[PDB]
Design a protein around this ligand. Sequence first.
Ligand SMILES: [Mg+2]
Length: 148
Amino acid sequence: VEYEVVSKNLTSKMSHELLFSVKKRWFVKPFRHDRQLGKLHYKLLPGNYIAFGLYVLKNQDYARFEIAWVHVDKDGKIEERTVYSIETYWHIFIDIENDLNCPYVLAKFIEMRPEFHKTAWVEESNYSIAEDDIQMVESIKRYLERKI
Ligand SMILES: [Mg+2]
């Protein structure tokens, strides 16, 4: 199964979506990264993945952050759900990058946001976090709650 997520930076707004490998425990290698529509493409062994989404209306100093759970079965059948959604000031997410005491995956995801008018690029990372998906997703929430 190849699944589609949006990844675009426009003068008005950005929308930064990234899948995550519960299995490899670090972001998923996209084969194609379309700059022509604002899209990423994915090759993924059927199983469990976390969609990290970041939407930002800059003229509103606005940013909505969401974590969804992507469950796709051995028949290729997709089903999603959001597990988490926070809304907040965009300027706050920027500072979270520099925040040292801030969940690495979160603090790195913010870092992978797309260059102006282009598509965020997932890198070959052979580093793996300590926590399993649940512990992680939690501390990513534990933090944001406090950081707002
Ligand atoms: Mg299942």
